[PDB]
Amino acid sequence: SKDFLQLKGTMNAFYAPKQRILSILAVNRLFGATETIDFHPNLLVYRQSSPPVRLTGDVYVVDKNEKVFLVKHVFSNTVPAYLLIRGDYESSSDLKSLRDLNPWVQNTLLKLLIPDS
Amino acid sequence: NKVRTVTEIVNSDEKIQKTYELAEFDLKNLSSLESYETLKIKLALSKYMAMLSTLEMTQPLLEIFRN
Structure with missing residues (x-):
């Protein structure tokens, strides 16, 4: 939909x-997706919060x-996904290793994170 | 401008006079001052860059101001 753009690659x-x-x-x-946007660190705007914003789930x-x-999130219409966030956050439960994630999301994350030097 | 010096022995009257042009010492002084000031300014600039690095911001300065 027009609300967002697919990340290139x-x-x-x-x-x-x-x-x-x-x-x-x-x-x-x-x-x-007729259009795509190159990933860039500016996209992950650091969230400011005097007390760390609490998070739940995975x-x-x-x-x-x-x-x-990375926060596990399901769209109310029951669409599983993960949200990549940057900011003053804290976890209610124990943080979990990325290896737990599936190869699909892991590959996407590698593409998005490792700079293409 | 210029100066001169006279050497003479106490018991003798045979004196040797030499003349000096102060321009040489003026050049020495000016070069020394220029080098010293350049060093001070470069030191200050390096210190500023270093403390900004100490803040440890990933992006370069211009990118920071563009964001």
Whole structure:
């Protein structure tokens, strides 16, 4: 939909500007994208919060130094996915290793994170 | 401008006079001051860059201001 744009080089990753959200479909492909946007760190705007914003469910650490996390999220219409967030966050439960994630999301994350030097 | 010096022995009257042009010492002084000031300014600039690095921001300065 027009609410977001598919990230270049990804079949299951998109970004919603008005929401400032990067999302990765758990098991689903994107389709119909006539446009794509190059990934860039600015997209992961650091969320400011005097007390760390609490998070629930499955949480994974991407960059402890940069407060980057991956949060399991299901769209109310029951669409599984993960949200990549950067900011002052804390986890209600124990943080989980990324290896737990499926190869699909893992490949997308590698593409999005490792700079193409 | 210029100066001159006279050497003479106490018991003798045979004196040797030499003349000096101060421009050489002026050049020495100016070069010394220029080098010192350049060093100070470069030191300050390096210190500024270093403390900004200490803040440890990933992006370069211009990218930071563009974001």
